[PDB]
């Protein structure tokens, strides 16, 4: 439960960062190719 | 009856034999004018009050 709290909060925060930066896109079908433009956020998503 | 049923969309001139299609079309364009033009179609006339066996 504690571990899931940690990494799931991480995933949600990173996805929220992506959504906020992408003008509230929220849809993965129109989200490709953001690894280069989101270094830190992609790193966080990968860790989580 | 003519004005309400002999409307151009329900009207076909069939020619067979020693005729030319271009000549027939030209004569039809020249002659078949002032025909009735009613929005009601035979499909909707059949759809309303259809036939039941």
């Amino acid at each position: 439960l504690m571990n899931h709290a940690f990494f799931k909060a991480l995933l949600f925060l990173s996805a929220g960062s992506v959504i906020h930066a992408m003008s509230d896109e929220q849809d993965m079908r129109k989200m490709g190719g953001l690894a280069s433009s989101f270094p830190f956020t992609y790193a966080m998503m990968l860790m989580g | 009856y003519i004005q309400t049923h002999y409307t151009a969309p329900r009207m076909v001139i069939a020619a067979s034999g020693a005729v030319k299609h271009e000549d027939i079309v030209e004569q039809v364009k020249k002659l078949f004018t002032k025909l009735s033009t009613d929005a009601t179609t035979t499909a909707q006339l059949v759809a309303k009050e259809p036939a039941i066996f």
């Binding site: 280069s36 433009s37 989101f38 270094p39 830190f40 992609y42 790193a43 966080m44 990968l46 860790m47 | -």
Partner: protein
């Protein structure tokens, strides 16, 4: 940099450094823990060996 008619600014230096460093820390932690507890996880030898 621009290629046809679209220019894309480079991501910030601190963004890149932070992401790269934290991922490197993750991978080094995984490698170190694998070296330390590899045989124990894989059944090669018990912890008291």
């Amino acid at each position: 940099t621009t290629y046809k008619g679209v220019t894309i600014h480079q991501p910030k230096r601190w963004h890149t450094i932070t992401g790269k460093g934290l991922c490197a820390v993750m991978w080094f932690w995984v490698l170190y823990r694998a070296k330390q507890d590899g045989p124990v996880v894989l059944g090669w030898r018990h912890p008291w060996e």
